[PDB]
Design a protein around this ligand. Structure first.
Ligand SMILES: *[C@@H]1O[C@H](CO)[C@@H](O[C@@H]2O[C@H](CO)[C@@H](O)[C@H](O)[C@H]2NC(C)=O)[C@H](O)[C@H]1NC(C)=O
Ligand SMILES: *[C@@H]1O[C@H](CO)[C@@H](O[C@@H]2O[C@H](CO)[C@@H](O)[C@H](O)[C@H]2NC(C)=O)[C@H](O)[C@H]1NC(C)=O
Ligand SMILES: *[C@@H]1O[C@H](CO)[C@@H](O[C@@H]2O[C@H](CO)[C@@H](O)[C@H](O)[C@H]2NC(C)=O)[C@H](O)[C@H]1NC(C)=O
Ligand SMILES: *[C@@H]1O[C@H](CO)[C@@H](O[C@@H]2O[C@H](CO)[C@@H](O)[C@H](O)[C@H]2NC(C)=O)[C@H](O)[C@H]1NC(C)=O
Ligand SMILES: *[C@@H]1O[C@H](CO)[C@@H](O[C@@H]2O[C@H](CO)[C@@H](O)[C@H](O)[C@H]2NC(C)=O)[C@H](O)[C@H]1NC(C)=O
Ligand SMILES: *[C@@H]1O[C@H](CO)[C@@H](O[C@@H]2O[C@H](CO)[C@@H](O)[C@H](O)[C@H]2NC(C)=O)[C@H](O)[C@H]1NC(C)=O
Ligand SMILES: *[C@@H]1O[C@H](CO)[C@@H](O[C@@H]2O[C@H](CO)[C@@H](O)[C@H](O)[C@H]2NC(C)=O)[C@H](O)[C@H]1NC(C)=O
Ligand SMILES: *[C@@H]1O[C@H](CO)[C@@H](O)[C@H](O)[C@H]1NC(C)=O
Ligand SMILES: *[C@@H]1O[C@H](CO)[C@@H](O)[C@H](O)[C@H]1NC(C)=O
Ligand SMILES: *[C@@H]1O[C@H](CO)[C@@H](O)[C@H](O)[C@H]1NC(C)=O
Ligand SMILES: *[C@@H]1O[C@H](CO)[C@@H](O)[C@H](O)[C@H]1NC(C)=O
Lengths: 404, 68, 184, 35, 49
C-alpha cells in the first residue's frame, strides 16, 4: 500500500592505463653489445610491440564504445525546476571551472626506463561532456532520444510513462508528487553522503589502478635482479670479465629479462581481456538502463527499474539506478474468480481482493480498490469448471442508466 | 611520444609534440587518433581538437509535448 | 619466421648442425635450439588461446543476438539497431555472420501543448494508453509514437481521484457516447 | 468470441485497408435500450 | 609429472646432482633445472588464469 524510492550505485571499470614498451631501451639501454646479441634471438620485439599496440587500440575502443552513444551534445536548460525534483547534485555546475558535478568531484577526489605511458584519447573534460549530454537527454527528452530525434517531454509525464512501464497505472504519481519528490531528494542526499562514507565503496577502480601500478613497479624492479649472473649492470660485466664468460653472463641476463617481459605482457593481455568484458557489460547497461527502461528484474538495481543516470569517473563509469521498492505491505483475502448470474467473471488486469466484507479489484502492485464493474472484467465459460470461485454481485452501469 | 622537443610548423600537444601539421581553430569530425583529443586529418595535413558532435540544444517546458 | 632465428646456436639449419658437429657439442646446440623453439611455440599457443577465448565470447554474443533478434522481437532499446527494433534477417559470411536489422525510426516532429489530466464534473480523467495533446483549441488523445488524434471518449479514459490533488489540469468536456445513443 | 464493439476499435474508412471483408458486427446494449 | 623430468641436466634429483658433480658446474646444471621447473610452473599458472 506504499512505495519507497531507493537510489543504489554500481561501479564498472571501463578502461585501464595504456602501456607501450621499448625492447632495446628496457633490455639493453645503452650497451651496443646487448643490442647486437638481441638480434640473435630473432623476432621477440615486434610481437610484443604489436600486442601492446593492440591492447592500446582495444582500450581506446572500449572507452569510446561505452560513452559515444549519442550523436548530438544536448544542452541542459538554464532553469532547474522540473516539478519538485531537485536535480542539482548530478548536473554540471558552472561555478567549478572543470565542468564537474559534485558527485563527479567526490568520485574524482577519492581515486588516487623504457616504460612510457600513452595518454587516453578522451580526456576527462570530453567524457564529462558526454555524461552531461546523456544526463540532459534522459532528463528532458525521455527515452526517445536514443532512437531518433529528441522530443520535448515534461518530466512528470515521462515519469508517469515509466510507472506505466512497470505494470502500475498513471493514477498513482500525480496524487503524491510532493512526497515522491521529497523521497527522491532525500535519496540523492543520502547517496551523496554515503558514497564517501566507506573507503571500500570504490573498490574496483582502486583495484585496477593498484594492480596496474604494482605490475609496472614489479616490471621496473626486475632490472636490479642478478638472474644468476655476477652483477645486474651491463657496463660492469663487460668492463671486468673476459668476453667468453661475458657472453654467457649477458645471455643469462637477456633470457631472464625477456622471460620477465613475456610474463608482464601475458598478464597485461589477461587484464585487458577482463576489462574489455567488463566494458561490454557497461556498454550494455549504458544502452539499456539509461537510454531506456529495462524490464529485467535485478539487472539494474535491487527492485523494479524506473531510470538511471551516468556519472563520469576516473578510468571507469559510475551509475545511479533509481529503483522502486514497494515496502509496507498489507495482506487480504482473495478469490480467483467471481460468479454472477451463473457465468464466471475474470479481472481484466488486476486481482479480486476482499477486505473481509465487500470485494474490490485493484492493481497488481498498489492497493487502490475499485468497485467491480463489467467494463474492467470479461466473461468466459460457466461457474462449474473454475475452482475456488465465490458468489458476489457485479455492478453494471446500464441498470441505473436505463431507468433514468 | 612524450618529448618536449626543444632539443631536436611545430605544435605541442599533451601527448607530445607534432611536426609537419598545422593547427585549426575550428573543429572537424576526426578519423585518426593521437591522444588527448587532438585528431589529425587531411583536407595539407591539419590537426584539430576533436569534434564532440553537433551542439544541438533542445527546448523544455512543463506544458509542451512533441509527437512525431 | 622463428625458424630462421639462430637462438644463439651455430646455425639455424638443423641438418647442418647434425652434419658438421660431434654429439658432445651437438647435444648443447640441440638443447639451445629446442629451448628457443619451445619458448616460441609456447608464446604462439598462449596468444592463440587468448584469441580463441575472445572469439568464443564474441560468438556467444552473436548467438544471443541471433536468438533474441531473428527468432523473435526484442523490446530493449538499442540492442539490435539504432532505434525501435522490428525484426532482423541473418546473412552468412566467411568466418562470421552479418545481420540486417530493420528499425523503426520516427521523424518530422511537431510541437504541441499538453496537460497531465483533464477535470470534468469534479472528477479527474486520465488517458488509458495515450497522452492529452492540444493543438491550441481542442483536446485529443494520441498514441505515444505516432500522431493520431481522437475525440475524448469515456471508453478510453478512466476516472480516479478528485479535482484538487492532481496538478496542472485543464478544463474541457468529455464526449460520452451513450448519451446521444439513448437520445435516438 | 463473438465480435463486438468491446474488443474492436474503429478507424478510418472502408477504402484503403487492403484485404478487408464484409461482415456485420454484433453490438451490445441493443436488446437493452428498447426493453 | 613435469616435476620428475631431466630438463637437459645430468639428473632430476636434488641430492643426486648436489653431491656427485663439482659445484662450479653443478650450479649451472641446477640453474637450468630450476629454470625449466619455473617455466613449467608459469605455464600451469597461465593455463589456470
Ligand atoms: C508512505 O510512506 C511515506 C514515507 O515513506 C509517508 O510519508 C510520511 O508521512 C508522514 C505523515 O504521517 C510525515 O510525517 C512524513 O514526513 C512523511 N515522510 C516523508 C519522507 O515525507 C506516507 O505517509 C506513507 N503513506 C502514504 C499513503 O503515502
Ligand atoms: C514551469 O517551470 C518553470 C521553471 O522552469 C516554473 O517557473 C517557476 O515559477 C514559480 C512561481 O512561483 C517559481 O516559484 C519558481 O522559482 C520558478 N522556477 C524555478 C526557477 O524554480 C513554472 O512555474 C513552471 N510551470 C508549471 C509548473 O507549469
Ligand atoms: C538541491 O539540494 C542541494 C543539497 O541538498 C541544495 O544545496 C544546499 O543549498 C543550501 C542553501 O543554498 C546550502 O545551505 C547547503 O549547504 C547546500 N547543500 C549542498 C550539499 O550543497 C540545493 O539548494 C537544492 N536545490 C533546490 C532547488 O532545492
Ligand atoms: C471493507 O471496505 C469497505 C469499503 O472500502 C468498508 O465499507 C465502508 O465502511 C465504512 C465504515 O463504517 C462506512 O462508513 C462506509 O459507508 C462503508 N462503505 C460502503 C458500505 O460502501 C468496510 O467497512 C471494510 N471492511 C472492513 C472489515 O474493514
Ligand atoms: C452460489 O449460489 C448458488 C446458487 O444456485 C449455489 O449453488 C447451489 O448450492 C447449494 C449448496 O451447495 C446446492 O445444494 C445447490 O444444488 C446449488 N445449485 C446450483 C444451481 O448450483 C452455490 O453453491 C453458491 N456458491 C457459494 C460459494 O456460495
Ligand atoms: C485544432 O484541431 C481541430 C480539429 O481538426 C480544429 O478544428 C477544426 O477546425 C476546422 C476549421 O474551421 C473546422 O472546419 C473543423 O470542423 C474543426 N473540427 C471540429 C471537430 O470541429 C482546429 O481548428 C485546430 N486548431 C488549430 C489552431 O489548428
Ligand atoms: C474549471 O472551471 C471551474 C469553474 O467553476 C473552476 O472552479 C473554480 O475555481 C476557482 C479557482 O480554483 C475557485 O475560486 C472557484 O470557487 C471554483 N468554482 C467552483 C464552482 O468550484 C476550476 O478551477 C477550473 N479548472 C481549471 C483547471 O482551471
Ligand atoms: C495476513 O492476514 C491475517 C488476517 O487476515 C493476519 O492474521 C496475518 O498476520 C497476515 N499476515 C501477515 C504476514 O501479516
Ligand atoms: C617545454 O620546456 C619549456 C622550457 O623548459 C617549457 O616552458 C614548456 O612549458 C615545456 N613544455 C610543456 C608542454 O610543458
Ligand atoms: C586559435 O584561436 C586562438 C585564440 O584566438 C589563437 O590564439 C590561435 O592563434 C588560433 N590558432 C591559430 C592556428 O591561429
Ligand atoms: C517548438 O518550440 C520550441 C520553443 O518554442 C522551439 O525551440 C522549437 O524549434 C519548436 N519546434 C518546432 C518543430 O517548431
Amino acid at each position: 500500500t506504499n512505495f519507497t524510492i531507493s537510489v543504489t550505485t554500481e561501479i564498472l571499470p571501463v578502461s585501464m592505463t595504456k602501456t607501450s614498451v621499448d625492447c632495446t631501451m628496457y633490455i639493453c639501454g645503452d650497451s651496443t653489445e646487448c643490442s647486437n646479441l638481441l638480434l640473435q634471438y630473432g623476432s621477440f620485439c615486434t610481437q610484443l610491440k604489436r600486442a601492446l599496440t593492440g591492447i592500446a587500440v582495444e582500450q581506446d575502443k572500449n572507452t569510446q564504445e561505452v560513452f559515444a552513444q549519442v550523436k548530438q551534445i544536448y544542452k541542459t536548460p538554464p532553469i532547474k525546476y522540473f516539478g519538485g525534483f531537485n536535480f542539482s547534485q548530478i548536473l554540471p555546475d558552472p561555478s567549478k571551472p572543470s565542468k564537474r558535478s559534485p558527485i563527479e568531484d567526490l568520485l574524482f577526489n577519492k581515486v588516487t626506463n623504457g616504460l612510457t605511458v600513452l595518454p587516453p584519447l578522451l580526456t576527462d573534460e570530453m567524457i564529462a561532456q558526454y555524461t552531461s549530454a546523456l544526463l540532459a537527454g534522459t532528463i528532458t527528452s525521455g527515452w526517445t532520444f536514443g532512437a531518433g530525434p529528441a522530443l520535448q517531454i515534461p518530466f512528470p509525464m515521462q515519469m508517469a510513462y515509466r510507472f506505466n512501464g512497470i505494470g502500475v497505472t498513471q493514477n498513482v504519481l500525480y496524487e503524491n508528487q510532493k512526497l515522491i519528490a521529497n523521497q527522491f531528494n532525500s535519496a540523492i542526499g543520502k547517496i551523496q553522503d554515503s558514497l564517501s562514507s566507506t573507503p571500500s565503496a570504490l573498490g574496483k577502480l582502486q583495484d585496477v589502478v593498484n594492480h596496474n601500478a604494482q605490475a609496472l613497479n614489479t616490471l621496473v624492479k626486475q632490472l636490479s635482479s642478478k638472474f644468476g649472473a655476477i652483477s645486474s649492470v651491463l657496463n660492469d660485466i663487460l668492463s671486468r670479465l673476459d668476453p667468453p664468460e661475458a657472453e654467457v653472463q649477458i645471455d643469462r641476463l637477456i633470457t631472464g629479462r625477456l622471460q620477465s617481459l613475456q610474463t608482464y605482457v601475458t598478464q597485461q593481455l589477461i587484464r585487458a581481456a577482463e576489462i574489455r568484458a567488463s566494458a561490454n557489460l557497461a556498454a550494455t547497461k549504458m544502452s539499456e538502463c539509461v537510454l531506456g527502461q529495462s524490464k529485467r528484474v535485478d539487472f539494474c538495481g535491487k527492485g523494479y527499474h524506473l531510470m538511471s543516470f551516468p556519472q563520469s569517473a576516473p578510468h571507469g563509469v559510475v551509475f545511479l539506478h533509481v529503483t522502486y521498492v514497494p515496502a509496507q505491505e498489507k495482506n487480504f483475502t482473495t478469490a480467483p474468480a467471481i460468479c454472477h448470474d451463473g457465468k464466471a467473471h475474470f479481472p481484466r488486469e488486476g486481482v479480486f481482493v476482499s477486505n473481509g466484507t465487500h470485494w474490490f479489484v485493484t492493481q497488481r502492485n498498489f492497493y487502490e480498490p475499485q468497485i467491480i464493474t463489467t467494463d474492467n472484467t470479461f466473461v468466459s465459460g460457466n461457474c462449474d469448471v473454475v475452482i475456488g470461485i465465490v458468489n458476489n454481485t457485479v455492478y453494471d452501469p446500464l441498470q441505473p442508466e436505463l431507468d433514468s | 611520444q612524450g618529448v618536449n622537443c626543444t632539443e631536436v610548423n611545430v605544435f605541442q600537444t599533451r601527448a607530445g609534440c607534432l611536426i609537419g601539421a598545422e593547427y585549426v581553430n575550428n573543429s572537424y569530425e576526426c578519423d585518426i587518433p593521437i591522444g588527448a583529443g587532438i585528431c589529425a586529418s587531411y583536407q595539407s595535413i591539419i590537426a584539430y581538437t576533436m569534434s564532440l558532435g553537433a551542439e544541438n540544444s533542445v527546448a523544455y517546458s512543463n506544458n509542451s509535448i512533441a509527437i512525431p
